[PDB]
Amino acid sequence: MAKIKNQYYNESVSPIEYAQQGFKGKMRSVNWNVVNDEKDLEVWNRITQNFWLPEKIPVSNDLTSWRTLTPEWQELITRTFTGLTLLDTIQATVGDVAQVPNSLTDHEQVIYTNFAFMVAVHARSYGSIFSTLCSSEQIEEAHEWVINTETLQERAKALIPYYVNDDPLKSKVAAALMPGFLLYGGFYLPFYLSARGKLPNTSDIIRLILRDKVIHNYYSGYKYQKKVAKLSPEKQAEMKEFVFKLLYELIDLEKAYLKELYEDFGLADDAIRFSVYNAGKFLQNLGYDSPFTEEETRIEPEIFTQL
Amino acid sequence: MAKIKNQYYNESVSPIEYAQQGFKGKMRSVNWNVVNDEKDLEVWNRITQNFWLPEKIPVSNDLTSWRTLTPEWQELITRTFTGLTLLDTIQATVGDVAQVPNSLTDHEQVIYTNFAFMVAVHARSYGSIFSTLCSSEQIEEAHEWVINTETLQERAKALIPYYVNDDPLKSKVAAALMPGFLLYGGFYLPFYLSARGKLPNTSDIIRLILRDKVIHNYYSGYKYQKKVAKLSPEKQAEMKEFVFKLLYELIDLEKAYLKELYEDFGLADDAIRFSVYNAGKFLQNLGYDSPFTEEETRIEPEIFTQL
Numbered sequence: 001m002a003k004i005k006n007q008y009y010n011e012s013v014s015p016i017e018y019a020q021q022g023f024k025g026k027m028r029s030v031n032w033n034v035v036n037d038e039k040d041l042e043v044w045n046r047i048t049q050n051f052w053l054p055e056k057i058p059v060s061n062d063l064t065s066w067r068t069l070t071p072e073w074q075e076l077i078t079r080t081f082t083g084l085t086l087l088d089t090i091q092a093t094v095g096d097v098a099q100v101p102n103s104l105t106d107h108e109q110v111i112y113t114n115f116a117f118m119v120a121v122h123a124r125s126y127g128s129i130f131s132t133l134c135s136s137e138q139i140e141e142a143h144e145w146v147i148n149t150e151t152l153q154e155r156a157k158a159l160i161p162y163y164v165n166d167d168p169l170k171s172k173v174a175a176a177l178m179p180g181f182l183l184y185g186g187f188y189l190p191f192y193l194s195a196r197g198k199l200p201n202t203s204d205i206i207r208l209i210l211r212d213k214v215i216h217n218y219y220s221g222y223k224y225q226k227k228v229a230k231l232s233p234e235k236q237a238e239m240k241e242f243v244f245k246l247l248y249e250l251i252d253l254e255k256a257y258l259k260e261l262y263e264d265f266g267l268a269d270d271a272i273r274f275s276v277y278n279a280g281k282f283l284q285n286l287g288y289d290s291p292f293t294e295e296e297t298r299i300e301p302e303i304f305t306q307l
Numbered sequence: 308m309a310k311i312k313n314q315y316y317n318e319s320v321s322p323i324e325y326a327q328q329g330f331k332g333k334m335r336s337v338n339w340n341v342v343n344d345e346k347d348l349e350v351w352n353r354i355t356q357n358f359w360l361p362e363k364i365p366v367s368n369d370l371t372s373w374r375t376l377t378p379e380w381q382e383l384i385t386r387t388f389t390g391l392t393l394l395d396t397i398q399a400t401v402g403d404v405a406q407v408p409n410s411l412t413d414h415e416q417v418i419y420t421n422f423a424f425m426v427a428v429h430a431r432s433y434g435s436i437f438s439t440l441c442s443s444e445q446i447e448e449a450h451e452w453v454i455n456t457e458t459l460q461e462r463a464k465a466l467i468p469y470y471v472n473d474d475p476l477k478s479k480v481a482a483a484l485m486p487g488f489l490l491y492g493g494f495y496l497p498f499y500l501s502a503r504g505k506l507p508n509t510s511d512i513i514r515l516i517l518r519d520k521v522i523h524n525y526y527s528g529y530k531y532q533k534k535v536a537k538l539s540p541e542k543q544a545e546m547k548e549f550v551f552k553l554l555y556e557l558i559d560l561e562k563a564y565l566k567e568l569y570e571d572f573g574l575a576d577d578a579i580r581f582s583v584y585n586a587g588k589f590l591q592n593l594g595y596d597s598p599f600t601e602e603e604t605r606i607e608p609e610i611f612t613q614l
Contacts, residue, residue, distance in 0.1 A: 008451040015397045019467055026454040027463055029393035032434025033446050048360055048428075086336035090322045093416045097404050109400045110427035117424040120417035121355075127339025139340050144315040147333040156334055160326055 006034055016101045016109060030106045040107035043219055047114050050215075052208050054125035059132040062201045066133045069198070075141075076265060077189065078134055081126045082142040083152055083261075084186045087178055088123035090156055092116050094163050095175040096216070102168040104223060115216050119179075122209045129202055151257040155182060158253060172224050173243055173286070177250060180217035180285060184278040185258045188271040191306035203306075221285035228287070243286060251279060273298050313341055323408045323416060337413045347414035350526055354421050357522075359515050361432035366439040369508045373440045376505070382448075383572060384496065385441055388433045389449040390459055390568075391493045394485055395430035397463055399423050401470050402482040403523070409475040411530060422523050426486075429516045436509055458564040462489060465560060479531050480550055480593070484557060487524035487592060491585040492565045495578040498613035510613075528592035535594070550593060558586060580605050 012028035013021065035041045066074065096116035103109045130139050146152060162174035187206065194203040228236055255272055262268035277297035280290035299307075319335035320328065342348045373381065403423035410416045437446050453459060469481035494513065501510040535543055562579055569575035584604035587597035606614075 006447060006450075008447070008454050012454040014400070015393075015463070015467065016400050019401060019470070023464070023468065026460060027393060027397075028450060028454050029389055030396045030430050030434075031446075031450055032431055033437055033443075044431075051358055053355055082336055086322075086334060089337045089413070090334075092420055093321070093323050093407055094326060097407060097420065100400055100404060106396070110424070110430070113399055113404065113420065113423040113427055116420040117417070120420055123337050123417070124339055124351075127337075130340055136340075139338075140313060140315070143313075143335060143338055147315050147319040147335050153333060156322070157330070160322065161330065163326070 006031075009034075014106050014109065016103075020101060028106075030110070032107070035107060036105045037107070039222060040105055040111060043111055043215065044107065044114075047111070047118065047212070047215060050211060051118075053121065054128040054205055057201055057204050057208075059129055059201050059205070062133065062199045065198050065200070073265070074134070074138065076261075077193075078130065078138050078142040079145050080186050080189050080261065081129065082139075082146050084183070085123045085126045086146055086152070086156065087182055087186075088119050088126070090160065091175070091178050092120040092123065094160060095178055098163040098165055098171055099175055099220070102165065102172055104226060108223065111219065115219075118212050119216070122212065125205050125209065129205065133202075149257075149260070151253070151260050155250065155253045155257060158250060169224065169227060169239055170242060172220055173246065176217055176220035176224070176285070177247070177282070179213035180220075180282040181247070181250065181275070181279055182254065183213055185254055185261075185271055185275040188267070188274045188303070189262075191303050192267065192270075194306050195302040217282070217285060221287070225287045240288060243283070243288065244291075247279060247283070251276065270300065270303075274303060313338075316341075321413050321416065323410075327408060335413075337417070339414070342414060343412045344414070346529060347412055347418060350418055350522065351414065351421075354418070354425065354519070354522060357518060358425075360428065361435040361512055364508055364511050364515075366436055366508050366512070369440065369506045372505050372507070380572070381441070381445065383568075384500075385437065385445050385449040386452050387493050387496050387568065388436065389446075389453050391490070392430045392433045393453055393459070393463065394489055394493075395426050395433070397467065398482070398485050399427040399430065401467060402485055405470040405472055405478055406482055406527070409472065409479055411533060415530065418526065422526075425519050426523070429519065432512050432516065436512065440509075456564075456567070458560070458567050462557065462560045462564060465557060476531065476534060476546055477549060479527055480553065483524055483527035483531070483592070484554070484589070486520035487527075487589040488554070488557065488582070488586055489561065490520055492561055492568075492578055492582040495574070495581045495610070496569075498610050499574065499577075501613050502609040524589070524592060528594070532594045547595060550590070550595065551598075554586060554590070558583065577607065577610075581610060 009028065009031070011026065013025035014030075015027050018025050018027050069077075093116075096112050096119065099112040099115075100109050103112070159174045159177060162170050165171045187210070190199065190203055190206045193199050194206075228239055231239070254275055258271050258275065259268045262271050273296060276292055277299055280292045280297055283290050316335065316338070318333065320332035321337075322334050325332050325334050376384075400423075403419050403426065406419040406422075407416050410419070466481045466484060469477050472478045494517070497506065497510055497513045500506050501513075535546055538546070561582055565578050565582065566575045569578050580603060583599055584606055587599045587604055590597050
């Protein structure tokens with residue numbers, strides 16, 4: 001009989017929904033005075049207060065440390081970081097922006113535009129490190145190595161087709177696998193170096209990148225769970241099967257890449273365990289149980305501390 | 308005979324191009340150490356150093372000023388700003404993100420993710436103003452008015468179909484029309500109030516929004532001109548015809564809306580001239596000549612100063 005508060009919201013659509021429906025409906029503005037899910041406001045406040053730029057970190061203080069490393073190890077660092085910059089590039093320009101039309105709330109739509117911009121800043125910060133420490137030849141040979149190393153490329157090629165959003169839940173899982181899983185095999189190396197007193201200022205940038213990417217992974221898992229809980233029991237079963245199948249395939253690709261990257265340095269076995277440990281955390285973030293054994297996820301305490 | 312510097316760039320594609328080509332090619336990371344167009348670096352540096360959040364502005368200092376306004380004028384401000392928040396919402400979630408795959412350079416792809424995030428901040432800042440000054444009833448009735456006012460909706464509905472990117476140059480023009488043209492009929496009102504000593508702290512937020520949106524318009528015009536200059540003379544003619552046809556149609560829609568919004572307050576005639584003045588600047592930003600007369604673009608010096 002009586003009008004409810006904010007009835008206009010039920011008689012309108014967001015602009016992206018207007019487009020998805022084929023251009024029908026009355027469009028509403030975002031309402032930041034009525035937040036439908038308090039978690040959206042909490043995350044908005046945290047990610048915007050955490051804004052940073054790499055020019056504030058004195059990476060040049062690392063030059064003495066960098067010059068004590070052999071050319072082989074300088075090459076390893078440049079290659080590893082350039083491979084991470086590729087993942088950043090995919091997230092910023094494809095994966096995170098593809099989540100905007102997958103949103104449950106108006107406020108979530110713009111939180112993912114923050115995510116995409118901040119992982120662009122992460123890619124910029126790797127550039128800033130190279131500008132300070134590397135020679136032009138080191139930089140160019142790392143970019144050549146990235147495009148020509150098939151084990152590296154295959155990890156990226158496995159995930160990009162899901163961002164076409166044929167299925168919004170599969171897209172969201174494929175997006176979260178970047179900051180929630182593929183990050184960690186590369187971050188093993190700065191954690192290893194930091195524990196041995198090398199490149200302390202570079203490590204500060206690594207920790208700022210980590211602070212952002214952890215929230216990106218958490219928020220995607222939160223929205224995944226809220227949507228999956230509304231599906232039928234058999235659709236929930238199909239989604240759980242897809243997640244495990246995709247993750248197992250990606251672990252195989254990641255193991256092959258980390259072996260190629262690290263084997264000559266003796267770091268491959270430890271980095272793979274570090275990666276699989278974080279695959280277990282990734283599943284828990286989606287509301288699933290981890291199947292991995294204690295032995296295959298063992299981490300050195302000094303790496304756990306750096307984390 | 309000899310390899311050129313950065314040959315890898317010519318043998319690879321960005322991730323969005325890999326997707327556009329149907330999943331073929333070797334993917335390259337962004338290279339922030341080799342910037343192909345120096346203008347991209349300049350704009351990246353400016354927009355990131357200009358980061359701001361509305362919580363830093365003491366809008367509560369405007370309460371005394373706000374309480375001297377009649378309820379009719381408080382309603383006008385709330386309606387006008389909520390209509391601007393709708394435009395912000397379209398830019399953040401549809402228009403600016405649609406420019407990422409239209410880019411000429413890798414660096415441009417992530418500059419547009421910054422644009423989308425910052426116009427989300429603009430929408431947030433209008434919310435922040437309402438939280439401080441408005442009653443809950445004022446806020447709700449403005450959202451109801453936005454969805455139910457056809458002259459307001461028609462301006463948005465005219466532009467959204469171009470963001471599907473059937474034509475990247477038409478998409479880019481439709482994107483730039485938001486910060487480059489539709490902004491100004493709404494910004495007439497805070498400029499009018501500020502010139503009369505009302506709401507000085509709100510005006511500071513307006514000027515921060517303006518500082519961002521001006522760069523958004525400029526950068527889109529720069530990339531429009533660089534691409535159009537590579538087309539055949541007859542394709543350049545077709546594009547110029549489209550721009551003028553679309554702008555003239557949008558001016559008609561904007562005039563109808565500003566008359567409905569402002570006529571009872573006596574502000575409509577001045578606001579329309581202010582709008583058409585900026586339509587002339589919009590054409591110049593795309594490399595075209597303005598056809599508008601001095602009489603139809605006349606601005607009060609006090610408004611020109613506020614600008």
